[PDB]
């Protein structure tokens, strides 16, 4: 009933490339959708230039997306070779505007944004989301907040009882 993504799942997507940028501790799910949007234009424009580079001779790449409470790693839809692997905690934000999924993790103030394309972009972001919390909640229960279940039957009775 939750074990689903602790093991993980895999979605077929399309990697377009990446783009590195600068962030500062704690921005905003509002200011992030911005940077995220400029991280997509970066690579879209980088792709048009990519295409053209092919005239002097398609340009994207097929990948699988492994999603879990542990990590989120991209692999070769063909060679099945890892192309990148980020432990979930190092991933801070993802978004699914249109069939374009973008996620950004800490490149180990210097973030790196990966840009993929998937007719399931929708479904895809949602999952990462659950992982985020499922992972989060675990990355919460282990800290003695065993009352993680309780802490929500608390973050509520700590809000109405706050009137």
């Amino acid at each position: 009933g939750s074990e689903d993504l602790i093991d993980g799942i895999i979605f077929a997507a399309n990697y377009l490339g990446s783009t590195q940028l600068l962030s500062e501790r704690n921005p905003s799910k509002n200011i992030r959708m911005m940077q995220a949007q400029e991280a997509v234009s970066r690579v879209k424009r980088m792709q048009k230039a990519a295409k053209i580079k092919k005239k002097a001779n398609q340009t994207l790449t097929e990948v699988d997306l492994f999603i879990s409470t542990q990590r989120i790693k991209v692999l070769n839809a063909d060679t099945q070779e890892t192309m990148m692997d980020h432990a979930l905690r190092t991933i801070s934000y993802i978004a699914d505007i249109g069939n374009i999924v973008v996620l950004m993790a800490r490149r180990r103030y210097k973030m790196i944004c990966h840009v993929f394309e998937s007719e399931d972009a929708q479904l895809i972001a949602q999952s990462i989301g659950q992982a985020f919390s499922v992972a989060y909640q675990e990355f919460l229960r282990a800290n003695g907040i065993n009352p993680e279940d309780l802490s929500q039957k608390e973050y509520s009775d700590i809000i109405n009882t706050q009137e």
Binding site: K29, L88, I91, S92, A95
Partner: peptide, 14 residues
């Protein structure tokens, strides 16, 4: 136009 943040990241991390 939906984006989610990692409670876990925006935690120990930042």
């Amino acid at each position: 136009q939906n984006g989610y943040e990692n409670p876990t990241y925006k935690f120990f991390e930042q």
